[PDB]
Amino acid sequence: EVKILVDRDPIKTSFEQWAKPGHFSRTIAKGPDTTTWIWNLHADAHDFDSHTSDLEEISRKVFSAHFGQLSIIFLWLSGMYFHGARFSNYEAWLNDPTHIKPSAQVVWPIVGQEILNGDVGGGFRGIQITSGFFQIWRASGITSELQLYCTAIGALVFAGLMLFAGWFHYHKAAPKLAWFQDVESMLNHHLAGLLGLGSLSWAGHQVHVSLPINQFLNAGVDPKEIPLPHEFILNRDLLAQLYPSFAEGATPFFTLNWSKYADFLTFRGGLDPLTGGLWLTDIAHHHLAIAILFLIAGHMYRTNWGIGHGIKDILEAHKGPFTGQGHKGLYEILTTSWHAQLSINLAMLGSLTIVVAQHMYSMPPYPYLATDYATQLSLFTHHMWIGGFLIVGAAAHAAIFMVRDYDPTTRYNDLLDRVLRHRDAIISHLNWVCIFLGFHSFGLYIHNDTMSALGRPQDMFSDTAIQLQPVFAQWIQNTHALAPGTTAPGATASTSLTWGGGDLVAVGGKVALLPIPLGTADFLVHHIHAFTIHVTVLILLKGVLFARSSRLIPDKANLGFRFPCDGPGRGGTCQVSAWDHVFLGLFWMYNSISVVIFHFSWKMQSDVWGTINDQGVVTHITAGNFAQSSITINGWLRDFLWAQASQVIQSYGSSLSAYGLFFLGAHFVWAFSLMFLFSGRGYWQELIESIVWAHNKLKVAPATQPRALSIVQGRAVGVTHYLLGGIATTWAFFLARIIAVG
Amino acid sequence: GPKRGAKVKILRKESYWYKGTGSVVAVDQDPNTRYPVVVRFNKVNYANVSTNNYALDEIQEVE
Amino acid sequence: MFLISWRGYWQELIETLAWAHERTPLANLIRWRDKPVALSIVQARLVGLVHFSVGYIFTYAAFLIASTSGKFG
Amino acid sequence: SHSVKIYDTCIGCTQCVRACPTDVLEMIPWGGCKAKQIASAPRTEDCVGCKRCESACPTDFLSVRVYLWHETTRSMGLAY
Amino acid sequence: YQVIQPINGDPFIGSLETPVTSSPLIAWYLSNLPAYRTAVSPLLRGIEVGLAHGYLLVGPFVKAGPLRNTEIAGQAGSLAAGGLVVILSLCLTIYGISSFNEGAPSTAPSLTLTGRKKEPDQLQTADGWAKFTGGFFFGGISGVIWAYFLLYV
Amino acid sequence: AALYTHHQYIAGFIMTGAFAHGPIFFIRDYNPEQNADNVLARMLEHKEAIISHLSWASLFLGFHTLGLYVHND
Amino acid sequence: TPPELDPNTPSPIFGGSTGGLLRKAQVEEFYVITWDSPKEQIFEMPTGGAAIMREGPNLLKLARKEQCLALGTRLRSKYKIKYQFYRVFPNGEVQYLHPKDGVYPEKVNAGRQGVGQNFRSIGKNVSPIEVKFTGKQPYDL
Amino acid sequence: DFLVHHAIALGLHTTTLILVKGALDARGSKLMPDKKDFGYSFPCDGPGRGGTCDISAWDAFYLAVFWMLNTIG
Ligand code: CLA
Ligand code: CLA
Ligand code: CLA
Ligand code: CLA
Ligand code: CLA
Ligand SMILES: CC1=C(/C=C/C(C)=C/C=C/C(C)=C/C=C/C=C(C)/C=C/C=C(C)/C=C/C2=C(C)CCCC2(C)C)C(C)(C)CCC1
Ligand SMILES: CC1=C(/C=C/C(C)=C/C=C/C(C)=C/C=C/C=C(C)/C=C/C=C(C)/C=C/C2=C(C)CCCC2(C)C)C(C)(C)CCC1
Ligand SMILES: CC1=C(C/C=C(\C)CCC[C@H](C)CCC[C@H](C)CCCC(C)C)C(=O)c2ccccc2C1=O
Ligand code: SF4
Ligand code: SF4
């Protein structure tokens, strides 16, 4: 019987706990004897499992926490809209999107930083933004700064509401555990109410506000001269002038004469030639269909009426000869353990962010986006990074479940057990396939470097020597290019210009998109991707599968999820914990994503982006050198890194100088991590002994005894500074490069 | 030996509080006890311990 | 690599590889005389430092000689 | 095998013995401390050298000490 | 019914019995391989193994080698294959010298799956391994020569 | 250039080695009693002073050199 | 007191894994742990996976002594059940290991002679130079 | 020249900090008063007492090599 369950006033609201650091932990609440205390206070702050054993209290904590997060995000959006209204060149940009650089940040004039306010156009001086907000705002039909202001106020209000909701649902009316456990209902409401009504109502805004205003903008009429959005709702005559379907109102909808609505609900595909973005009509139709799909999907699970599936039933129905009991027991696991859920959701959300990156490069959804190379590069890189991080997190919390929540005596599952019983085979096979992949991908590169160095280019792996064609990908390309004529008749063009066949979409003299050629170089990089991903998976999966025990450490589970080791014995057992596997997996994720974004950058600058001359002459940014240059490590070293770092290294004395500063700073932080990664806390402790002596000599030794960081924190600081450094380096490199030569 | 609550200097070289001062808690009268002098310290060691046993020749009553 | 990743990870990995070898037919006929284990902690530090130093020296030597002799001042 | 030694600063809290994962240490009668007992290491052939015992010892300095010595198949924690 | 069972009924031996490991087709296949002819002279086994391996070895050397696009492709590739045959024979030889003492008996299993006693494979002896290596060399070179003949004569 | 770089790196390694056989002496050979109150034992006496002052020097130089460079940049 | 005898008692219910014995059990040594369970119940295997201990006598062969003491520790701590374990050599010989004298090593028991006990504080160890060119270590005195 | 010379000063002082500290604490420290009983080179002393990675004099050398390479760099 699914219903609203809530406890009234579980926790009194008082600043008393604010004045007592570490209140959540009986150990930390006692106070500091050494400095280590401090770090612990922050490390275990959000580890609610180590706070209480009660699943209910934890669930409440996470719920209000989520409200806090949403509040923060609303405040963030509020900031973006407000800065877009008060400190930007957005209207000017609307007047001329093809020759004005998007800027929504200005700096104050002190210590010379005024130079950062550069000539972005529109009679405005500031920092060029690469978030892509301007194209969103144009797509939403926003024309004035006033509307941006109003959206900012709305977002601020929503921030207040989310914060209050957090306080309310923690201190005043806190849901019961059964409420959180109503997964059938939660799934129904999230499928139908969130996504369904979300894309439905959004389709509403698109059909009533986006389409008309954008039609006007594309027509060329001055934005101020364009009718306000509410008028298109009040006066249906305007929409009728733009799309005659509205003359018949909602009649063809109910009478099933949907063909009449082909004016604003299309299925053309490809890109709009005068904007370089997907057709907004296609987008509106897309959101309508999606809305229907999710709406019907949200009626799958049984709640307070007979109809509907039971999750446990569907799970217990799937069991084979190879797997025995199958998915039985998983419902209980996934309705009592937050870490399992977090694992699944992190893996899938990360993967989703990755697919978002790819789909947004290859099918530009916003007007004047494809030709804003800075924005595209930025979006791709950003979402790729977010994805990778979320995935590593999925590994972490999978392992955390494996150590803290797994209990085969009370919550047994056959699949998990069987996985555990042949983990050696799984990990060994992953190992082998990783070595094979490494050899047969990187080894090709080294082979090429050697042959090239020895004066034997005819012995290389390339398109002009020993060819390794991506036949399968080429076939998929051709198939997807010929699809509109055969297997998708209702579609006018392809879903993306990047497919093997097609024309070329250009906007304002710049290339928006064109068919992307795939050769030996692409085979090579793709197999590098497969390799790096496989290694990352090797590390993480090994980490979670051996989190509880191994032949080396039979009782590793009792040591916890996060611990440095089990001593120098057994030959040495450093980094045996699953946490340390998350730690190594982070480095490998960094590696993989780095080579991925380099792949994207070089390929785009070489074979896609660039200017287009009259009669159809396309001049790319790096003139198609990829196919010949990316086949050796030296090519990446010289033609990519060395050649393209030019913009960042000579950005001094201009508006892009901050990128030079960040280039150097990031290199510095990266190197700085190596001190932590390469060393150990014993040395630091003894050094600290000497320094402490010096402080005692002058009566200035603190009561909170100065301690070297723990082994684990040394590792965490190490990997954190390593990632921050490397990623920020590629950040500065990318942005300076693409902003200067774009 | 020294009295209870007596401030003593540590003479055991391998002690965390070597050359430092602590307070006497109790002295074992059993002559078989090799380290009778129970001492407590103001600061904990690397093992989070604030108390330790010493012998008669490992403490020096000072003030 | 040798400087950042430490022993236990590799030891367990190698354990799974040992199982792998003892359970692979044909290859089963071949067996090691010295049990495969991960390098020791100190050994790891030394080997890592060695790769680091060699890389350091060789890289800077190549740059020095090439940049200088490429133009000869 | 590794070497394990007990020193007379031992106060017989037995923490090290119940910390060993391979049953190397044990408690024997003694008169040097109030607990009437002291630690002992009769089975160092099974010692792996993890040093959990040393991490369990309260005394300052340690009353149990592990000197990693000659390396054997048992001390390497091998199962193959 | 279930597909995966403990190895030979023993659930505490570090393996599992799957269609890949133990099914009639694969079992028959492996048991008929020269390596598992546990009751025959290791010499003949060596001849077969070396023959097959040298024969396959001729392929990739000829087509992928540095002289693949020259009139002297077959000679070069086959020679290289013979070279690898020699090197691998050297490897096999030192493996035999290092692993087996002339006095030491067979290290091969002396039991079957059923649990009955049987004569240990003489492949796991010094003399037996030496014979196997001789067979790998003879058969290896012979296989290289034969493949080269079929390919270029 | 080759000669200068060569001899400076050789000199560096040789120096680290000097300071490496320094403590090997302190561990394997040094006899505290036979060195009672001499310059060496007295050296071990105020070790904290030596180490802490080296620490101060390094700290100062680092803060100010990095600081001045970053300033100029 | 005489050590416990080692008969052929039934093994726990388990589908088998890849974490069990290897060649080391055949050529060097393996181990055997026995216990007496009040009922049929699930326990986690030291080598990974879940097994069912039967009621009465149970005998499990493991690859390492550490695995044995681990499992035994989990038995005594979680299931409140006494355990023993032995080492077994390929020739057939069995060596009784734990608990050695019938009493857990945590609690004192008369009869045990000291091994490796130095009657001196740890700081009073001689410097390495005192033992140079001898076979002795400063902690062997 | 001034700036880079002070960088060199930083390098020398820091490298000597590592090496000297490693030499003087080679016999022992408060974290490990009996270090001399373990020798010049050993893995560590274990995760106990807060953790003792890179506590041997050999490890001090190993750390110092990075700073020498940096300095001569
Ligand atoms: C994440 C969102 C975000 C970010 C990164 C920024 C960033 C910026 N804003 Mg924007 N802003 C935002 C949201 C954001 N804003 C929102 C939602 C609004 C609408 C209210 C604004 C309205 C706004 C205006 C009107 C201006 C800016 C300006 C700026 C710039 C200078 C900031 C400054 O120096 O403040 C001033 C610095 C301080 C106030 C420092 C005081 C910090 C105190 C001492 C900390 C005390 C700690 C305590 C716990 C915090 C208070 C808690 C409180 C509950 C009591 C900077 C780029 C300026 C600008 O861009 O000029 C060209 C500017 O004029 N912002
Ligand atoms: C506004 C009045 C108010 C007061 C007096 C309290 C008081 C309390 N809360 Mg409550 N709560 C409130 C509002 C309030 N809350 C709101 C608005 C929310 C929704 C977020 C919550 C949700 C909540 C949860 C889930 C929990 C509490 C808990 C508590 C108790 C301990 C928390 C603590 O002391 O750490 C004080 C925390 C801070 C001072 C840090 C604030 C962290 C902010 C909000 C995160 C965002 C910072 C952001 C990342 C900025 C970083 C910038 C940059 C440096 C990176 C204490 C009685 C805890 C409890 O009862 O434990 C048994 C507990 O678990 N509260
Ligand atoms: C889906 C979101 C999500 C949520 C809710 C959690 C929640 C949790 N994680 Mg998980 N995790 C996630 C994603 C998430 N994680 C991701 C994406 C990764 C990959 C990096 C991980 C990898 C991971 C590890 C390895 C561990 C956790 C742990 C935890 C638990 C304790 C967290 C804590 O208290 O730290 C307090 C929060 C902080 C200390 C924040 C500081 C983090 C760094 C310093 C900030 C980075 C700098 C920033 C980018 C820029 C700085 C700019 C300027 C300030 C210099 C908590 C249940 C820990 C645990 O024990 O679980 C039981 C744990 O050991 N997580
Ligand atoms: C790791 C990737 C890789 C690959 C695929 C190649 C491939 C090649 N190299 Mg290159 N090489 C590499 C890395 C690689 N190299 C690196 C890293 C370097 C720098 C050290 C070099 C330096 C180098 C030089 C100097 C030369 C080559 C040459 C060659 C060519 C001839 C090689 C040869 O004769 O071997 C013989 C080939 C084999 C023995 C094949 C064995 C593998 C088979 C397929 C295993 C089959 C297993 C089976 C599928 C499993 C199931 C069994 C079941 C069916 C029964 C060949 C195209 C030569 C050339 O001129 O190229 C044009 C040459 O002169 N390489
Ligand atoms: C480029 C990377 C890098 C940097 C900057 C350092 C820096 C340092 N190391 Mg070295 N170290 C490194 C790599 C690095 N290391 C590597 C790869 C190894 C091999 C493992 C070592 C091994 C090592 C050893 C063995 C020792 C050192 C020591 C030192 C310190 C020497 C004294 C000094 O110069 O103080 C100047 C301080 C700095 C240069 C640090 C910068 C401080 C910044 C500029 C101030 C704050 C800026 C700003 C306000 C911060 C905002 C951040 C925000 C998030 C709040 C110095 C902090 C020695 C030491 O600790 O002596 C006391 C020492 O004994 N390191
Ligand atoms: C952007 C943004 C924002 C804003 C937002 C908005 C503005 C929203 C809106 C929203 C909306 C405005 C929504 C709406 C919705 C509606 C709906 C969802 C409706 C539905 C309906 C229906 C579904 C119907 C049905 C029916 C039919 C069809 C017939 C029969 C009868 C009935 C009636 C049942 C904020 C500030 C937050 C923040 C920042 C960002
Ligand atoms: C200016 C001038 C001059 C003068 C000069 C001089 C006088 C110089 C000096 C210099 C010097 C004066 C230098 C020094 C250096 C030193 C060093 C470099 C040291 C090192 C040390 C060590 C290495 C140590 C070792 C050890 C240890 C650690 C332990 C104990 C033992 C031993 C000792 C072994 C003249 C007039 C002539 C000319 C004009 C100009
Ligand atoms: C450098 C380094 C340290 C030393 C780093 C430390 C001790 C970090 C602490 C440094 C900060 C600056 C101390 C905290 C300062 C206080 C907050 C006081 C602030 C004073 C105001 C002026 C800001 C380790 O402890 C360590 C441990 C394990 C492996 C590697 C390493 C490692 O590489
Ligand atoms: S982590 Fe530090 S302490 Fe733990 S084992 Fe590796 S080295 Fe020894
Ligand atoms: S080291 Fe580990 S194993 Fe050896 S004795 Fe101390 S605890 Fe037992």
Side-chain angles (χ1 to χ4, degrees), chain A residues 33-34 685 689 696 705 707, chain B residues 16 43-48:
Chain A
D33 297 325
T34 67
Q685 247 306 328
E689 293 182 9
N696 260 326
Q705 294 188 100
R707 244 57 165 172
Chain B
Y16 180 89
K43 57 189 68 174
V44 290
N45 59 15
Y46 294 127
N48 294 282

Side-chain angles (χ1 to χ4, degrees), chain C residues 19 23-33, chain E residues 13-15 30 33 35-36 95 98-99 124 129:
Chain C
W19 176 90
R23 299 308 168 185
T24 298
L26 296 178
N28 270 333
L29 275 45
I30 310 297
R31 46 179 53 98
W32 53 75
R33 292 201 63 198
Chain E
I13 304 296
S15 189
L30 288 188
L33 249 52
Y36 285 105
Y95 177 85
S98 60
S99 300
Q124 302 295 332
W129 195 271

Side-chain angles (χ1 to χ4, degrees), chain A residues 5-10 56 60 168-177:
Chain A
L5 299 171
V6 138
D7 283 323
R8 183 188 294 100
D9 296 276
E56 186 174 65
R60 297 174 176 186
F168 180 80
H169 287 308
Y170 193 77
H171 296 267
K172 273 294 184 223
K176 272 251 168 54
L177 176 58

Side-chain angles (χ1 to χ4, degrees), chain A residues 608-722:
Chain A
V608 178
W609 295 341
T611 60
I612 180 170
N613 189 259
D614 56 84
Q615 208 260 356
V617 174
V618 178
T619 294
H620 292 298
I621 309 187
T622 75
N625 60 343
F626 187 87
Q628 296 294 343
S629 299
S630 60
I631 54 177
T632 56
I633 302 299
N634 198 33
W636 285 88
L637 198 259
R638 158 181 31 85
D639 296 338
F640 183 72
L641 294 184
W642 180 87
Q644 302 186 23
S646 311
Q647 285 69 39
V648 93
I649 65 187
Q650 66 213 14
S651 63
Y652 274 12
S654 80
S655 61
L656 305 183
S657 59
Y659 291 120
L661 295 181
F662 263 81
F663 198 58
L664 294 187
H667 270 92
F668 178 92
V669 172
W670 182 84
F672 178 77
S673 71
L674 308 183
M675 173 177 49
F676 295 88
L677 293 176
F678 293 172
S679 64
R681 78 170 304 274
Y683 173 92
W684 300 108
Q685 247 306 328
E686 299 179 329
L687 184 61
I688 287 171
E689 293 182 9
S690 295
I691 304 173
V692 156
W693 174 91
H695 284 68
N696 260 326
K697 245 297 179 177
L698 294 186
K699 301 181 174 183
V700 290
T704 319
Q705 294 188 100
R707 244 57 165 172
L709 307 172
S710 68
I711 307 170
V712 173
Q713 184 182 357
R715 298 176 184 162
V717 167
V719 66
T720 305
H721 289 67
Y722 191 100

Side-chain angles (χ1 to χ4, degrees), chain H residues 58-70:
Chain H
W58 189 99
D59 296 325
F61 160 85
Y62 145 86
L63 293 174
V65 178
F66 293 98
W67 258 101
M68 171 247 114
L69 287 175
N70 180 67

